[PDB]
């Protein structure tokens, strides 16, 4: 009951050629008939779960305007709220609910590592998050009620901000386009497009987020390089001449520091493993969870009509190497695939369902069974009859 892809009538190549990271797009009834597999009450209960990242934003009716209370919550917090002018936000719902992960199957024309998560929001009449911008590529899917979306087609460079709000909300905002999304509609926004969503009634919004790293965030993820190093090369200066002005960090010193860092970056094998790990790593507090299968019963259960499910597509990826080998990435961990079975990597990460028919070639291999056992035990895959 889901389209093969989003985009309404558009083909992905046309979308990526004209709109993706360029200009917004309103798709009326991208999903022809559809409603949240989750209810507002269920989302509320889901916000109370331990380890989940959820936020309650009160535009009005709170202690002070635009108050932000953070989860995890409890049912007590949900009785004492006004009936209007507030909104709940829950991140990584695709991780928590397989039904929302099924929605992830529509945008599969963008690589897995570019995906972050689907966050679901809820708001009664008047509720809003305010006018703001995101560095995300985002598909705003209206899932219930009706929301008024105001935007501006120009990406913003300078960010005019409101002082000390515990939120990133634009000081000035002049919309050039207003729409009213009803369930099934989807509104795409490229990065840094300002938007102001306001609920006309009890409504939910399924926000499919894509994110890409900048220099700061990569720099902050560099420590994992240290994991593959065991020290590495060390700065040496046996050719040191006596220091005139010993306080000076000489250009020769900085030459060596640069060289040491470059050697770390210019090694493609190393950089691939590092990046593949840090980009599939769980961003927030929520990790995968396992249940214990023999290779015999797994082979039997699968041949008996079972299926393998991907619990986290955004946390699943791979890289091809020059010698034919490959490295599979699952939730931060790197699994080295010998060139013999390197071709399982695209299969395990691709669009195609993982069934007995699909997996037939490698089913008889022992190393492949060892991998499936490890992945299922790591919580990367779920065996489903």
């Amino acid at each position: 009951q889901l389209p093969e892809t989003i985009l309404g009538g558009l083909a992905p190549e046309e979308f990526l050629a004209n709109y993706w990271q360029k200009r917004p797009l309103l798709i009326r009834q991208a999903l022809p008939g559809f409603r949240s597999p989750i209810t507002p009450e269920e989302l509320a209960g889901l916000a109370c779960e331990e380890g989940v990242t959820a936020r309650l934003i009160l535009e009005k009716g709170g202690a002070y305007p635009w108050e932000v209370r953070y989860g995890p919550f409890e049912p007590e917090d949900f009785v004492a709220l006004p009936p209007t002018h507030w909104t709940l936000l829950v991140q990584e719902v695709d991780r928590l609910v397989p039904e929302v992960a099924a929605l992830l199957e529509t945008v599969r024309f963008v690589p897995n590592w570019r995906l972050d998560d689907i966050m679901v929001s809820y708001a009664p009449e008047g509720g809003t998050v305010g006018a703001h911008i995101d560095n995300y590529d985002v598909f705003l899917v209206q899932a219930w009620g009706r929301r008024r979306w105001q935007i501006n087609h120009r990406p913003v460079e300078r960010e005019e901000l409101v002082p000390g709000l515990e939120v990133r909300l634009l000081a000035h905002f002049e919309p050039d386009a207003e729409w009213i999304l009803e369930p099934g509609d989807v509104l795409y926004l490229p990065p840094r497009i300002p938007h102001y969503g306001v609920a006309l009634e009890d409504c939910m919004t399924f926000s499919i987020g894509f994110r890409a790293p900048d220099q700061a965030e990569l720099a902050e993820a560099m420590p994992r390089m240290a994991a593959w190093l065991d020290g590495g090369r060390r700065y040496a200066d046996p050719d040191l001449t006596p220091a005139d002005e010993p306080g000076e960090i000489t250009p020769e010193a900085l030459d060596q520091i640069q060289a040491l860092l470059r050697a770390l970056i210019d090694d493609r094998e190393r950089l691939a493993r590092w990046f593949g790990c840090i980009i599939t790593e769980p961003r927030r507090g929520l990790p995968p969870e396992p249940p214990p299968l023999s290779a015999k019963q797994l082979h039997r259960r699968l041949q008996q009509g079972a299926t393998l499910r991907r619990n986290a597509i955004p946390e699943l990826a791979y890289v091809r190497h020059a010698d034919g080998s490959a490295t599979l990435f699952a939730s931060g961990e790197a699994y080295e695939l010998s060139p013999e079975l390197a071709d399982v990597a695209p299969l395990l990460t691709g669009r195609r369902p993982l069934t007995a028919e699909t997996l037939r070639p490698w089913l008889e291999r022992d190393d492949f069974l060892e991998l499936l056992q490890t992945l299922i035990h790591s919580g990367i895959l779920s065996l489903i009859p």
Binding site: L89, M119, V129, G130, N135, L161, G164, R168, L169
Partner: peptide, 9 residues
């Protein structure tokens, strides 16, 4: 140092 809305934790 306020964080963007779509971020979370």
């Amino acid at each position: 140092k306020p964080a963007e809305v779509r971020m979370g934790k």
